[PDB]
Amino acid sequence: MQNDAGEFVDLYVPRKCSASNRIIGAKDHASIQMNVAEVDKVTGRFNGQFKTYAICGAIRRMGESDDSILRLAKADGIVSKNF
């Protein structure tokens, strides 16, 4: 995104999907941004640490987006590993 001097020349850096690793377009209204809450370890209380994920529109209209969110929650470690 650079030049030879070093100054940032592009106007923004677009997002990429967490499942297909494709660039989310500015007019792709099928794309999502979802927030999932992190809980305290012993109490079971919501404190506010957030770990958001984005899915591009093609994966969502494919029918395999829930599996993508399931694999992201497997990778982060919040949902149980035995499953």
């Binding site: 990429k16 999907c17 499942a19 297909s20 690793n21 494709r22 093609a58 994966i59 494919m62």
Partner: protein, 129 residues
């Protein structure tokens, strides 16, 4: 019948990355195929791959990332020199800043910048960007 294993291999990995898969199988193996994926793995366009060493011809499990755009094969293998490589790079790469030409010279199989540095030519295999 099957007359080019490398063209079918790169077509299969192109279809797999275009659909959005993560692992693919390539039915035949060759040393030239392993060199081709080694070039793309050194350049970071594909992930860490595997060799299913079965006694027929190795099956290759390639880990796919989203960094690949298109993998293509030029058939037949055209003779290319140092003076004629710029035309291929102009009409076959999408841009001058990225993309690589995989050509087989006598000192191995790698990208065209390294063959420019060693000042050698040969036969072209394909491209990726």
């Amino acid at each position: 019948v099957r007359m080019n294993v490398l063209a079918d291999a790169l077509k299969s990995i192109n279809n797999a990355e275009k659909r959005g898969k993560r692992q693919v199988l390539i039915r035949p193996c060759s040393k030239v195929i392993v060199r081709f994926l080694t070039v793309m793995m050194k350049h970071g366009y594909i992930g860490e791959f595997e060799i299913i060493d079965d006694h027929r011809a190795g099956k290759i499990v390639v880990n796919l990332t989203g960094r690949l755009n298109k993998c293509g094969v030029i058939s037949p293998r055209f003779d290319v020199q140092l003076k004629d490589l710029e035309k291929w790079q102009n009409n076959l790469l999408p841009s001058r800043q990225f993309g690589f030409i995989v050509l087989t010279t006598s000192a191995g199989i790698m990208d065209h910048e390294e063959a420019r540095r060693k000042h050698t030519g040969g036969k072209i295999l394909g491209f990726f960007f």
